[PDB]
């Protein structure tokens, strides 16, 4: 069998271990990011597998630098390991060059780290796609996504996990190029509630964060009040 090692090509020139890691990602619940005029907003459908867990357990949104947020989907231990890697890369960059790491360079470096785990029988590919979001006055809003193969692209809007296509289809309805973060949070909540499959999993929490000119370029959790009003708007739109 040609699918036991990331050091083995298939006869068709595929690396099946990477595709299986992508399948591990595609089994996870959905996260979305949308870049707009003055920042980037993240939302994640965070499935609650037991009512015994605290509201807030298993965050899928991470701060990797003060100006850079991270949203993950897939096997959560792997994603958190990559978030620690991203944090280390950002710290080393700041220590060496003396300013905040540009998002594109951070994306490229972490993507190359992910890629390094796709060449060898000694390690397995990461089972976690993740999003990177950032804002600065000089660079504006930037949103990148990295998959288990190590590919890295910039996006206006992106979705990862099991309902990726439905989310992208909803995002396409937005004129995100002309909207502000205060407008976009409502729409993010709306699409997450729309694409959430309430029949097969009964309860989820919405986690929302953003980074943009309204936070002076700091990545932060969405204030509780904006989260509940966004949820209320989403619920009534769900009507």
């Amino acid at each position: 069998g040609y699918d036991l090692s990331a050091s083995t090509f298939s006869p068709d020139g595929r690396v099946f271990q990477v595709e299986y890691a992508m399948k591990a990602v595609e089994n996870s619940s959905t996260a979305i990011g949308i870049r707009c005029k003055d920042g980037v907003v993240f939302g994640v459908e965070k499935l609650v597998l037991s009512k015994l867990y605290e509201e807030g357990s298993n965050k899928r949104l991470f701060n990797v630098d003060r100006h850079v947020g991270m949203a993950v989907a897939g096997l959560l231990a792997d994603a958190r390991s990559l978030a620690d890697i991203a944090r280390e890369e950002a710290s080393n960059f700041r220590s060496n060059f003396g300013y905040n790491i540009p998002l594109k360079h951070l994306a490229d470096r972490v993507a190359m780290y992910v890629h390094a785990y796709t060449l060898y029988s000694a390690v397995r590919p990461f089972g976690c796609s993740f999003m990177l979001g950032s804002y600065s006055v000089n660079d504006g809003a930037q949103l990148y996504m990295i998959d288990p193969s190590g590919v890295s692209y910039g996006y206006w809007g992106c979705a990862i996990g099991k309902a990726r296509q439905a989310a992208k289809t909803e995002i396409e309805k937005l004129q995100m190029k002309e909207m502000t973060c205060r407008d976009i949070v409502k729409e993010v909540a709306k699409i997450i509630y729309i694409v959430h499959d309430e029949v097969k999993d009964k309860a989820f929490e919405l986690e929302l964060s953003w980074v943009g000119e309204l936070t002076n370029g700091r990545h932060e959790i969405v204030p509780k009040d904006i989260r509940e009003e966004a949820e209320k708007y989403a619920k009534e739109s769900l009507k």
Binding site: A6, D12, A122
Partner: protein
């Protein structure tokens, strides 16, 4: 022989009974897996690379989707095949070029950079614990004595200089087209239009300016340059009127 196989010769880079390296052949199939084609052509003055830019997802930031990369001020490259592999090999090329300049005090010749990348891929073709990289690198640059150069290396560690070449799904048809054309002139003088015509013919597309990227180096302007949309459109319109 004739497709014989023994032991693990389809799983790692060991010889098959015919003396083939099946894993390298599969890396060649991986090059076509990405489904894109790139073309490069050299003339007396210019070396030009053109490739498809496919953006089906309206949500991609199309300014970040490129297969063209600056290696040094005077060396550009187009990558074909698996994207992450391509990015890693571009990073390695950039490191090797910078280190060359640091150690020797002059810019790396295109042939030497291509050779170095080919030797690294060879290392991946000879050690069993890792796979070859599935990406076929094409390099362009101006050499101070021989003028513009176009070199290509592949996952087998081969590297040859070309008058023109292609990579990816329609490599063979592009090669036939360029052979036929070069026979009509031992190189060209109007190169970007030839490259674009070749790509359009073998793809049967007739491109809009957002579907290709073009990079050039010239003896007058050795710095690697990526054409803007207006310049590509001006070439497409000048071609359309012939």
């Amino acid at each position: 022989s004739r497709g014989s196989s023994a032991g693990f010769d389809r799983h790692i880079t060991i010889f098959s009974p015919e003396g083939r390296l099946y894993q390298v052949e599969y890396a060649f199939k991986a090059i076509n897996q990405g489904g894109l084609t790139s073309v490069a052509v050299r003339g007396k003055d210019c070396a030009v690379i053109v490739t498809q830019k496919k953006v089906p997802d309206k949500l991609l930031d199309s300014s970040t989707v490129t297969h063209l990369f600056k290696i040094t001020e005077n060396i550009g490259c187009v990558m074909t095949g698996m994207t992450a592999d391509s990015r890693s090999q571009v990073q390695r090329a950039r490191y090797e070029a910078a280190n060359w300049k640091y150690k020797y005090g002059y810019e790396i010749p295109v042939d030497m950079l291509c050779k170095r990348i080919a030797d690294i891929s060879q290392v991946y073709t000879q050690n069993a614990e890792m796979r070859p990289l599935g990406c076929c690198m094409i390099l362009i640059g101006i050499d101070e004595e021989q003028g513009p150069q176009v070199y290509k290396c592949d996952p087998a560690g081969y590297y040859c200089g070309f008058k023109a070449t292609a990579a990816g799904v329609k490599q063979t048809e592009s090669t036939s087209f360029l052979e036929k054309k070069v026979k009509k002139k031992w190189t060209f003088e109007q190169t970007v239009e030839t490259a674009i015509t070749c790509l359009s013919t073998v793809l049967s597309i007739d491109f809009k300016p957002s579907e290709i990227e073009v990079g050039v180096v010239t003896v007058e302007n050795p710095k690697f340059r990526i054409l803007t949309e207006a310049e590509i459109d001006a070439h497409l319109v000048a071609l359309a009127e012939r």
